[PDB]
Paper text:
A homodimer carrying a subunit-bridging [[name]] cluster at the protein surface, the iron (Fe) protein of nitrogenase is best known for its function as an obligate electron donor for its catalytic partner during substrate turnover. Perhaps more interestingly, the Fe protein from a methanogenic microorganism, [name] (designated MaNifH), was capable of reducing [name] past CO into hydrocarbons under ambient conditions in the presence of EuII-DTPA, further illustrating the unique reactivity of the [[name]] cluster toward [name] (16, 17). Despite its archaeal origin, MaNifH shares a sequence identity of 59% and a sequence homology of 72% with AvNifH. Like AvNifH, MaNifH is a homodimer of ∼60 kDa, and it contains an [[name]] cluster that can adopt three oxidation states upon redox treatments: (i) the oxidized state ([[name]]2+), which is generated upon treatment by indigodisulfonate; (ii) the reduced state ([[name]]1+), which is generated upon treatment by dithionite (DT); and (iii) the “superreduced,” all-ferrous state ([[name]]0), which is generated upon treatment by EuII-DTPA.
Here, we report a 2.4-Å crystal structure of MaNifH that was generated in the presence of dithionite and an alternative [name] source, bicarbonate. A closer examination of the region surrounding the active site of MaNifH reveals the ligation of the [[name]] cluster by four Cys residues: two from subunit A (Cys95A, Cys130A) and two from subunit B (Cys95B, Cys130B). Interestingly, the electron density omit map (Fo − Fc) of the active site of MaNifH indicates the presence of additional electron density that lies immediately next to the crystallographic symmetry axis, seemingly held by two pairs of conserved Arg residues (R98A and R98B)—one from each of the two adjacent MaNifH subunit dimers. In this scenario, the [name] moiety has its C atom placed at a distance of ∼4 Å from the nearest Fe atom (Fe-3) of the [[name]] cluster, with the NH2+ groups of R98A and R98B assuming the “distal” and “proximal” positions, respectively, to Fe-3.
Numbering used by the authors:
A (entry chain A), B (entry chain B): 1 to 273
Write the structure that this text describes.
Amino acid sequence: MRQIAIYGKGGIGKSTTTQNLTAALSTMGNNILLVGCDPKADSTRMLLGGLNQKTVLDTLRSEGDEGIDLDTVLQPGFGGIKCVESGGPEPGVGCAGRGIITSIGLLENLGAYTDDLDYVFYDVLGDVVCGGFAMPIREGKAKEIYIVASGELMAIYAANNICKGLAKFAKGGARLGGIICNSRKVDGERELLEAFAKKLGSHLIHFVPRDNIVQRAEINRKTVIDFDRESDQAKEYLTLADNVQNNNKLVVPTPLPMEELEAMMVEFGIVEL
Amino acid sequence: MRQIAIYGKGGIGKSTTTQNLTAALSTMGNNILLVGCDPKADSTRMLLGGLNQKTVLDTLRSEGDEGIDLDTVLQPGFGGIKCVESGGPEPGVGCAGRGIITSIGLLENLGAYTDDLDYVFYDVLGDVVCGGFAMPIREGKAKEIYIVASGELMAIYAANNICKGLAKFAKGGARLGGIICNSRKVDGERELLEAFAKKLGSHLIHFVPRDNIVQRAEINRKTVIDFDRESDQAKEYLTLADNVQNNNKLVVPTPLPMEELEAMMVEFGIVEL
Ligand code: SF4
């Protein structure tokens, strides 16, 4: 079973890409488990069709004593992807590290990690690279990490910080699988992300273009692969999925020093002096 | 002395709004302290003109046998605004809340909360409402909270969760000052957010329009007020500033039940069934 996590700054379509990537991968005869570990993102709604599936932690906190049933917290979606949302911390009190480990622990007990699974995906928040949101990596639940980024200053800064945390758990086998660029239609965006990925010791595994059909598919509460299998953007995600599935270039990332990261921002006009 | 924090989902220009708001407030004869508590936001770069000012935590780890000079971590920028960055956690290991605790404490010890300050602003991450990022509220250091949101479901979801933390610590004195809308140029955005704010018991403090002057200012390392004092968008931030400064409606918010928040999305066409 492949054990993948997607990290990245919020607000640039990381959850859209994860759901479209998993949808595309399911059409290749893959059994996929998707666990949302991002308390600001609906990581499964394009695959399930609703809004905000009942989360593991909300179920656990809810009134009553009866034991959780797997069917409560794991719902089948497009392509047969099993969909789970861990849920957020108790507002102002809890910690997402304990919440994420709590959800995974309970999923393990209920048998969600079935022997016929080809992939498990974690969609993890990447806006803070704290010990809590790194627990999927630290505990070896996710060994193969992909970072969604865009040609924006703090999106690349976030990715670099994720790489620092990722590098800290290299001994356990965690690797960077590659950078995924969510096109913000910035000039030279692909060139910049290719250069960033190269300095990390990795590669831009795919460039995901802006296409209005993604907003149309989401308005219809679906992934692009589901909304229009033969569309161009659907072929993009299929390329992305093919590249992930057959990716054999996994590395311990080498995060950029601050002066090199800032220099690259000047070089590609992201900031003008 | 006003003690204000700005929370919100990331990726919708919250920190743009924070830096432009404080800039606009400095033109009104105000002495302001600005503390970045958001590890994916360069919360001071548009007031200082550089990139990633040296953080309190980086200064502490590099500390020598001597102490620490306030000028190392606190730097004056546009309008005379004192600018500080806490710094994120050690990637993958640390808790971001302890970094925020430590930086505020260090600012206290070195006397940065001077008698002539009119405002201190905390630019706080709001993508996870954990115990760590609640610390400016819990610790009594931030008493007047504004939330940046847009007409997107998870942006309003995120604000609703922030309000749950805020209400939980009402006896400590923290209050919701209002919602600020960063317009994503979607239909009925202002109407939806005005309804959201009313259901919380608050109000929409200002509707901030999408405007390419903003991207122009920031690529040139500036706020809009600085980049073009006579700009239209500058006048918008000045109105926001006047609204915040004169705001006398601070409430304990009443967060919306899940079904009521989803209903609001359907009512305003944000979600189509
Ligand atoms: S470790 Fe991370 S998620 Fe947990 S409380 Fe600290 S900042 Fe929040």
